[PDB]
Design a protein around this ligand. Structure first.
Ligand SMILES: Nc1ncnc2c1ncn2[C@@H]1O[C@H](COP(=O)(O)OP(=O)(O)NP(=O)(O)O)[C@@H](O)[C@H]1O
Ligand SMILES: Nc1ncnc2c1ncn2[C@@H]1O[C@H](COP(=O)(O)OP(=O)(O)NP(=O)(O)O)[C@@H](O)[C@H]1O
Ligand SMILES: [Mg+2]
Ligand SMILES: [Mg+2]
Lengths: 374, 374
């Protein structure tokens, strides 16, 4: 029949092994690498790392090296294991449930690295802290070694280096999408100024290396260099509040295909969420108030946000303490705070731009008016 | 600094309370009710329940009652607490990790009910099993009462009744979307024939009761009675293989707005996924093997899936052992197996309909090819 005994409890990393679809993208191990990139970028965003180096080995493994603080090797006071063993083997264990150890961290669930380990036949990592370099190895998510000291290092030579071999049984294909991972990694250098990011595909000999201090405008200009945007130089804005920061570059294109990237604590949000909603409302408000204060609007036509957005190319990078994502892969942002904050920020900053740059704003407005009439 | 002590381990329901966005749609508590609905529908899908009754009380709470097997009240052999206590209190604990207690269940993660309670100021449930009626109450996710024997019942009166009071701090709005929950509940009666589904919103004066012995074709006809489809009588198909079942009704609409509903073990998948991709592939493949065999397709123009799919209206219901969803909200199905299974079923079944009903099959092709003209 049906009793309490028929209720089974998955513990440790087993929930990830039995249903990985809810913890990662099972199409490719790219998002597993992303999880490791993110923890390195989070160290970078906290002013502790200045270099992320990603290597795609010919044996299918991927490795991420940062010069951040290194994940703790110390013994957990109420968990009996060294921190790294705890981090790699337990769900909902992480340093980012507060805003003490990381301010604007991409990681929030304490699940990321553990998913990598749970879905990797092998994980080998080297941590450098307190003058000593350590090594720990895992197999099929289980601890495969002890906390080894492999060498001595300079006191301030710190960092985490993690290399994982994705188990092909959990994925439609074990092959990495290099173009996507290349694009992803460069944007991390654009969005975290001062961070040097390198990628090395040992299968093709590719090397790439990025460093940008103030490059959001030039980043989006470069991604649509073939197309004619207006303003030709890409309206950019910003707003800081030490709990929320927003940066964006936006343009309107009469012809061609649209770059539309959005980010939350440097994590890409493919289905965009609420922060993109605020940018649309704010830009729309500033544009329907510019069409009316100047009577650019034929009569009978009213601008819907859809008309504003149909031909926009934007790059939105929001940073906030405690975002709210809909899943571990973090594809849309559902924080309701974000919609208003960006709408206001963009509404003020675009209104000033238009009343300062009247002829350009008209040419913007005509693109929206042409979409609404249609 | 930053040592192992700074790594926090959230246990119990604490992960849900600190980051509810990854476990539910925090825009409104609708998805909390869905989790309770889903567990009742799974009892129905296992041939043990024949009526689910949903009541949206004016005090903001929701209650879902089924006449199924009732969730276990005995003590778990290795967890020491009664089954209901384990179900409500622990993550990744369920009877749906195998195909023993439920064959085609919507639930797969063992997390659903725990999320509802974890995000509710109060939860009160009644179970009917073993001739005795039990009751247990929760507050803020914690057990607030014991497993009380509140009454006696007949041997064959069995069932589960759960009432939860969603904590308003976790949600953008505490009011339920009745239109959405109304539409949802009707699909459960349509997709599980013989199941009687009742909705009672005590605030809207609304009462509803759904029962269909065969309603898939009639369901889509009613939702697109406002537009003229082709075939006017709605091409439908089906296929069973003792591991997966697929049912669908599909039509092509020259004018009006397209209803496109997809389901996996009766759980709605709004961002459809692989089951819809296979249906699109099968129907498109079958239509060119018809446009080319009957030479209705101009050459130099080719039929792509987008052209077939541009104006399709479908309702697709897949049932399979071990689906794979991308998140707790189960918005996309990523099982790549399902894509092929439906493609074959749809490809064979659509080829037959066209070759028998060609004057209709032609007018279908005209919609697809004209759409390709652009
Ligand atoms: N490169 C690193 N350097 C230092 N600490 C790290 C590093 N990578 C991971 N950590 C620690 O590992 C813990 C858990 O990481 P992880 O499993 O990725 O979950 P999370 O990053 O905290 N949040 P999420 O990724 O959304 O599940 C964090 O609390 C960090 O303190
Ligand atoms: N109405 C019910 N009748 C009988 N058993 C139930 C009922 N509701 C819940 N259960 C049991 O409680 C377990 C946990 O349910 P739940 O937390 O909703 O997750 P799940 O159904 O296992 N899968 P998921 O919904 O994706 O998390 C189920 O596996 C059932 O065994
Ligand atoms: Mg992380
Ligand atoms: Mg469930």
């Amino acid at each position: 029949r049906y009793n309490a005994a028929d209720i089974e409890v998955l513990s440790g990393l087993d929930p990830v092994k039995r249903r990985p679809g809810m913890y990662t993208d099972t199409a490719r191990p790219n998002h597993l690498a992303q999880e490791v990139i993110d923890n390195s970028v989070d160290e970078a965003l906290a002013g502790h790392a200045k270099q992320i180096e990603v290597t795609l080995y010919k044996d299918g493994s991927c490795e991420v090296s940062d010069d951040g603080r290194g994940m703790p090797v110390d013994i957990h006071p109420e968990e009996k294991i060294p921190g790294v063993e705890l981090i790699l083997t337990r769900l909902h264990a992480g340093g980012k449930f507060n805003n003490r150890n990381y301010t604007f961290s991409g990681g929030l669930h304490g699940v990321g690295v553990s998913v990598v380990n749970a879905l990797s036949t092998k994980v080998e990592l080297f941590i450098k802290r307190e003058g000593s370099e350590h090594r720990m190895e895992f197999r099929d998510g289980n601890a495969a070694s002890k906390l080894e000291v492999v060498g001595t290092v300079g006191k301030k030579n710190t960092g985490t280096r993690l290399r994982f071999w994705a188990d092909p049984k959990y994925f439609d294909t074990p092959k990495f999408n290099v173009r996507a991972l290349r694009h992803l990694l460069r944007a991390k250098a654009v969005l975290c100024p001062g961070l040097t990011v390198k990628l090395h595909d040992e299968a093709t000999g590719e090397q790439d290396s990025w460093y940008f201090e103030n490059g959001l405008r030039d980043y989006l200009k470069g991604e649509m260099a073939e197309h004619e945007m207006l303003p030709a130089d890409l309206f950019v804005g910003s707003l800081k509040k030490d709990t929320e920061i927003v940066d964006w570059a936006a343009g309107w294109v009469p012809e061609g295909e649209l770059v539309q990237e959005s980010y939350v604590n440097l994590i890409p949000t493919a289905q965009h969420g609420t922060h993109v909603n605020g940018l649309r409302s704010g830009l729309t408000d500033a544009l329907r108030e510019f069409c009316d204060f100047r009577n650019l609007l034929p009569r009978g036509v009213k601008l819907a946000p859809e008309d504003v957005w149909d031909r926009v190319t934007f790059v939105l990078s929001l940073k906030m303490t405690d975002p709210q994502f809909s899943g571990q892969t973090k594809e849309r942002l559902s924080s309701r705070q974000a919609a208003g904050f960006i709408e206001g920020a963009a509404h003020d900053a675009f209104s000033l731009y238009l009343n300062q740059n009247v002829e350009i704003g008209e040419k913007i407005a005509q693109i929206a008016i042409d979409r609404a009439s249609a």
